[PDB]
Design a protein around this ligand. Structure first.
Ligand SMILES: CC(=O)Nc1cc(Nc2cc(NC3CC3)n3nccc3n2)ccc1C
Length: 331
């Protein structure tokens, strides 16, 4: 027998209530700017589907980030553009400034607002208890917004969070894996980086929703408060679920499998074993205790659930006691 269907607990029908054009990205026509407005300054890095550069817009002298695409299906390019245009102006959402057609590569190049990022491998070792709560609340503003707008990011991880610490400015970037949520839709499970993949992806449960981003956020919170990067360190996608089971326990995992009538890959049988649910205290030591409090642990536990339906929504997460001083300081 097949798996039990699932629906998002919140923002379930927001795309159904919108005109077809909002989410029907295959019919989206791309609006092209002038490629001569931009002069590349230097390379910043690379991605699976791109090469990214710092550039100067020669019409206004503004610094921009240019993402020149590698060959990618036209519908996937239209999807990222549509999602970016839909989320434009949203809290802590990266701004897509322009779309141009590269002359050498003949591919599109997406032009973004520049963020003066403080590299995560250097920034995280300086963050206080307050900074983690502050930036976690800022990520939640972006997530509650994109979820309310019927979009799942599906690639939440430290590298997709640009922080200008000096200006306490955060932007959630790289919407290249983002999708529109539609009740009853089965999505590709081959999304996100290994360490941030939700149990639904690892067990091949396709009818997932916004709650997938909440698991990714929990992985990020666990890595920050415990100073353990990555928190769930799998050797591959199968071992990734084993790393989760050694912390969350195998009992809740088999309960989750049973609830949704998920047929487990036979490989999993011999590697999952039997594991008790651990207490968060075993990850606490003299070097991370200043970032760990009962509020942090209670909040973390409520994010890292096998059952996607039982994880906090971004809005419920914002109401958690862990953020009381951040909320009070923002008012
Ligand atoms: C466009 C996109 O999402 N792809 C992406 C981006 C990067 N890298 C940066 C670097 C900076 N800022 C420089 C100071 C570090 N910014 N700023 C705003 C956005 C952005 N992106 C690397 C790799 C990829 C794939």
């Amino acid at each position: 027998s097949g798996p039990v269907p699932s629906r998002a607990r919140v923002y379930t029908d927001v795309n159904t209530h919108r005109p077809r054009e909002y989410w029907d990205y295959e019919s989206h026509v791309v609006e092209w700017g002038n490629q001569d407005d931009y002069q590349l300054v230097r390379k910043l890095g690379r991605g699976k589907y791109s090469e990214v550069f710092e550039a100067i817009n020669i019409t206004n002298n503004e610094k921009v980030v240019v993402k020149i695409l590698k060959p990618v299906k036209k519908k996937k390019i239209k999807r990222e553009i549509k999602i970016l245009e839909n989320l434009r102006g949203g809290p802590n959402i990266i701004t897509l400034a322009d779309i141009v057609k590269d002359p050498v590569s003949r591919t599109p190049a997406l032009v973004f607002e520049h963020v003066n990022n403080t590299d995560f491998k250097q920034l995280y070792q300086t963050l206080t208890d307050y900074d983690i709560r502050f930036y976690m609340y800022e990520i939640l503003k972006a997530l509650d917004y994109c979820h309310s707008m019927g979009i799942m990011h599906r690639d939440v991880k430290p590298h997709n969070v640009m922080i200008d610490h000096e200006h306490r400015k955060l932007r959630l970037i790289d919407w290249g894996l983002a999708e529109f949520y539609h009740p009853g839709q089965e999505y590709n499970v081959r999304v996100a980086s290994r360490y941030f993949k939700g149990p639904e992806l690892l067990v091949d449960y396709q009818m997932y929703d916004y709650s997938l981003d909440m698991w990714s956020l929990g992985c990020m919170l666990a890595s920050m408060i415990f100073r353990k990067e990555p928190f769930f360190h799998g050797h591959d996608n199968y071992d990734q679920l084993v790393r989760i089971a050694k912390v969350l326990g195998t009992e809740d995992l088999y309960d989750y499998i049973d609830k949704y009538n998920i047929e487990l890959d036979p490989r999993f049988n011999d590697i999952l074993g039997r594991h008790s649910r651990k207490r968060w205290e075993r990850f606490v030591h003299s070097e991370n205790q200043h970032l760990v409090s009962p509020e942090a642990l209670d909040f973390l536990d409520k994010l890292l659930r096998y059952d996607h339906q039982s994880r906090l929504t971004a809005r419920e997460a914002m109401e958690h006691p862990y953020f009381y001083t951040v909320v009070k300081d923002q008012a």
